[PDB]
Design a protein around this motif. Structure first.
Motif, PDB file in Angstrom:
ATOM      1  N   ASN A  17       0.840  -1.186   0.000  1.00 32.26           N
ATOM      2  CA  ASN A  17       0.000   0.000   0.000  1.00 32.26           C
ATOM      3  C   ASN A  17       0.885   1.248   0.000  1.00 32.26           C
ATOM      4  O   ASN A  17       0.869   2.024  -0.956  1.00 32.26           O
ATOM      5  CB  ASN A  17      -0.884   0.048   1.247  1.00 32.26           C
ATOM      6  CG  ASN A  17      -2.361  -0.110   0.881  1.00 32.26           C
ATOM      7  OD1 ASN A  17      -2.721  -0.360  -0.258  1.00 32.26           O
ATOM      8  ND2 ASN A  17      -3.193   0.048   1.906  1.00 32.26           N
ATOM      9  N   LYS A  18       1.635   1.403   1.080  1.00 33.50           N
ATOM     10  CA  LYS A  18       2.525   2.544   1.216  1.00 33.50           C
ATOM     11  C   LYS A  18       3.332   2.713  -0.072  1.00 33.50           C
ATOM     12  O   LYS A  18       3.346   3.790  -0.664  1.00 33.50           O
ATOM     13  CB  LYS A  18       3.390   2.401   2.471  1.00 33.50           C
ATOM     14  CG  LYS A  18       3.545   3.745   3.185  1.00 33.50           C
ATOM     15  CD  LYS A  18       5.007   4.007   3.550  1.00 33.50           C
ATOM     16  CE  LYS A  18       5.262   3.727   5.033  1.00 33.50           C
ATOM     17  NZ  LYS A  18       5.056   4.953   5.835  1.00 33.50           N
ATOM     18  N   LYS A  19       3.985   1.630  -0.469  1.00 30.27           N
ATOM     19  CA  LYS A  19       4.792   1.644  -1.677  1.00 30.27           C
ATOM     20  C   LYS A  19       4.007   2.322  -2.802  1.00 30.27           C
ATOM     21  O   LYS A  19       4.532   3.195  -3.492  1.00 30.27           O
ATOM     22  CB  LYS A  19       5.265   0.231  -2.023  1.00 30.27           C
ATOM     23  CG  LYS A  19       6.517  -0.139  -1.225  1.00 30.27           C
ATOM     24  CD  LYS A  19       7.784   0.316  -1.951  1.00 30.27           C
ATOM     25  CE  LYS A  19       9.000   0.251  -1.025  1.00 30.27           C
ATOM     26  NZ  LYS A  19      10.025   1.234  -1.444  1.00 30.27           N
ATOM     27  N   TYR A  20       2.762   1.895  -2.952  1.00 35.47           N
ATOM     28  CA  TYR A  20       1.899   2.450  -3.982  1.00 35.47           C
ATOM     29  C   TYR A  20       2.115   3.959  -4.124  1.00 35.47           C
ATOM     30  O   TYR A  20       2.431   4.444  -5.210  1.00 35.47           O
ATOM     31  CB  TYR A  20       0.466   2.195  -3.513  1.00 35.47           C
ATOM     32  CG  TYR A  20      -0.561   2.148  -4.647  1.00 35.47           C
ATOM     33  CD1 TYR A  20      -0.562   1.091  -5.534  1.00 35.47           C
ATOM     34  CD2 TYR A  20      -1.485   3.163  -4.782  1.00 35.47           C
ATOM     35  CE1 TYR A  20      -1.527   1.046  -6.600  1.00 35.47           C
ATOM     36  CE2 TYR A  20      -2.451   3.119  -5.850  1.00 35.47           C
ATOM     37  CZ  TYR A  20      -2.425   2.063  -6.706  1.00 35.47           C
ATOM     38  OH  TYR A  20      -3.337   2.020  -7.714  1.00 35.47           O
ATOM     39  N   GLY A  21       1.939   4.656  -3.012  1.00 30.88           N
ATOM     40  CA  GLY A  21       2.111   6.100  -3.000  1.00 30.88           C
ATOM     41  C   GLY A  21       3.338   6.513  -3.816  1.00 30.88           C
ATOM     42  O   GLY A  21       3.311   7.525  -4.514  1.00 30.88           O
ATOM     43  N   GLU A  22       4.383   5.707  -3.700  1.00 31.14           N
ATOM     44  CA  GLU A  22       5.618   5.977  -4.419  1.00 31.14           C
ATOM     45  C   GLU A  22       5.431   5.710  -5.914  1.00 31.14           C
ATOM     46  O   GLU A  22       5.715   6.573  -6.743  1.00 31.14           O
ATOM     47  CB  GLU A  22       6.773   5.148  -3.854  1.00 31.14           C
ATOM     48  CG  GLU A  22       6.980   5.438  -2.366  1.00 31.14           C
ATOM     49  CD  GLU A  22       8.144   4.620  -1.804  1.00 31.14           C
ATOM     50  OE1 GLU A  22       9.287   4.890  -2.234  1.00 31.14           O
ATOM     51  OE2 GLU A  22       7.865   3.743  -0.958  1.00 31.14           O
ATOM     52  N   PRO A  50      10.732 -11.644  -3.530  1.00 35.64           N
ATOM     53  CA  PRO A  50      11.689 -12.682  -3.186  1.00 35.64           C
ATOM     54  C   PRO A  50      11.436 -13.953  -4.000  1.00 35.64           C
ATOM     55  O   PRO A  50      10.411 -14.071  -4.671  1.00 35.64           O
ATOM     56  CB  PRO A  50      11.521 -12.891  -1.691  1.00 35.64           C
ATOM     57  CG  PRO A  50      10.165 -12.302  -1.336  1.00 35.64           C
ATOM     58  CD  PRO A  50       9.704 -11.455  -2.511  1.00 35.64           C
ATOM     59  N   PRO A  51      12.411 -14.896  -3.910  1.00 37.26           N
ATOM     60  CA  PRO A  51      12.304 -16.154  -4.630  1.00 37.26           C
ATOM     61  C   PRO A  51      11.293 -17.086  -3.959  1.00 37.26           C
ATOM     62  O   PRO A  51      11.433 -17.414  -2.781  1.00 37.26           O
ATOM     63  CB  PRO A  51      13.715 -16.720  -4.645  1.00 37.26           C
ATOM     64  CG  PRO A  51      14.467 -15.995  -3.541  1.00 37.26           C
ATOM     65  CD  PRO A  51      13.637 -14.791  -3.125  1.00 37.26           C
ATOM     66  N   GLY A  52      10.298 -17.487  -4.736  1.00 36.16           N
ATOM     67  CA  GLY A  52       9.265 -18.374  -4.231  1.00 36.16           C
ATOM     68  C   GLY A  52       7.996 -17.595  -3.879  1.00 36.16           C
ATOM     69  O   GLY A  52       6.971 -18.187  -3.545  1.00 36.16           O
ATOM     70  N   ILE A  53       8.107 -16.277  -3.966  1.00 34.61           N
ATOM     71  CA  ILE A  53       6.982 -15.410  -3.661  1.00 34.61           C
ATOM     72  C   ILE A  53       6.634 -14.578  -4.898  1.00 34.61           C
ATOM     73  O   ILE A  53       7.285 -13.574  -5.178  1.00 34.61           O
ATOM     74  CB  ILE A  53       7.275 -14.568  -2.417  1.00 34.61           C
ATOM     75  CG1 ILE A  53       7.843 -15.434  -1.291  1.00 34.61           C
ATOM     76  CG2 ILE A  53       6.032 -13.794  -1.973  1.00 34.61           C
ATOM     77  CD1 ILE A  53       8.101 -14.601  -0.035  1.00 34.61           C
ATOM     78  N   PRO A  54       5.580 -15.040  -5.623  1.00 34.99           N
ATOM     79  CA  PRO A  54       5.138 -14.351  -6.823  1.00 34.99           C
ATOM     80  C   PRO A  54       4.378 -13.070  -6.471  1.00 34.99           C
ATOM     81  O   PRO A  54       4.158 -12.778  -5.297  1.00 34.99           O
ATOM     82  CB  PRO A  54       4.282 -15.364  -7.566  1.00 34.99           C
ATOM     83  CG  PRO A  54       3.896 -16.417  -6.539  1.00 34.99           C
ATOM     84  CD  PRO A  54       4.785 -16.227  -5.321  1.00 34.99           C
ATOM     85  N   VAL A  72      12.484  -8.021   1.413  1.00 33.91           N
ATOM     86  CA  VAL A  72      12.790  -7.452   0.113  1.00 33.91           C
ATOM     87  C   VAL A  72      11.780  -6.348  -0.206  1.00 33.91           C
ATOM     88  O   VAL A  72      11.624  -5.959  -1.363  1.00 33.91           O
ATOM     89  CB  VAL A  72      12.824  -8.555  -0.946  1.00 33.91           C
ATOM     90  CG1 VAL A  72      13.956  -9.546  -0.670  1.00 33.91           C
ATOM     91  CG2 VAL A  72      11.475  -9.273  -1.034  1.00 33.91           C
ATOM     92  N   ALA A  73      11.118  -5.874   0.840  1.00 34.01           N
ATOM     93  CA  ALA A  73      10.127  -4.823   0.685  1.00 34.01           C
ATOM     94  C   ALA A  73      10.712  -3.698  -0.172  1.00 34.01           C
ATOM     95  O   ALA A  73       9.976  -2.989  -0.857  1.00 34.01           O
ATOM     96  CB  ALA A  73       9.683  -4.333   2.065  1.00 34.01           C
ATOM     97  N   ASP A  74      12.030  -3.572  -0.106  1.00 38.06           N
ATOM     98  CA  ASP A  74      12.721  -2.545  -0.868  1.00 38.06           C
ATOM     99  C   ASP A  74      12.784  -2.964  -2.339  1.00 38.06           C
ATOM    100  O   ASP A  74      12.594  -2.139  -3.230  1.00 38.06           O
ATOM    101  CB  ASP A  74      14.154  -2.361  -0.367  1.00 38.06           C
ATOM    102  CG  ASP A  74      14.503  -0.942   0.088  1.00 38.06           C
ATOM    103  OD1 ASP A  74      14.057  -0.577   1.197  1.00 38.06           O
ATOM    104  OD2 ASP A  74      15.207  -0.255  -0.683  1.00 38.06           O
TER     105      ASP A  74
END
Length: 99
Positions: A17-22, A50-54, A72-74
């Motif tokens: 969500n937050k990321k969205y703003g960006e 991350p690997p294994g997380i689509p 890996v939120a970044d």
């Protein structure tokens, strides 16, 4: 603008969500169009995960997977086809490091 989370899922549920703003450039916390994202997959592209997380909802992800996402939120990078609105970008935030 303040923020607060309580629970892995919550953390992520907010992250994307937050990321969205960006992705849009906004400064405030905006909501992600999950519905539209569900009905239409060609809405917001998510990469860097991350690997294994689509690129999917965190609901389908377990605490484990989450622990990673937030990690890996970044890396996670959202894409908004739509055009910009009007607001200087803010690459990286910086701050203290744990190590």
């Amino acid at each position: 603008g303040s923020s607060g989370s309580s629970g892995l899922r919550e953390q992520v549920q907010d992250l994307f969500n937050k990321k969205y703003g960006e992705a849009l450039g906004i400064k405030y916390p905006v909501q992600v169009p999950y519905k539209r994202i569900k009905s239409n997959p060609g809405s917001v592209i998510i990469e860097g995960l991350p690997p294994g997380i689509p690129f999917r909802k965190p609901c389908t992800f377990g605490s484990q997977n989450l622990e990673r996402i937030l990690a890996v939120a970044d890396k996670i990078k959202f894409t908004v086809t739509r055009p910009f609105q009007g607001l200087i970008p803010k690459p990286d935030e910086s701050g203290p490091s744990s190590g």
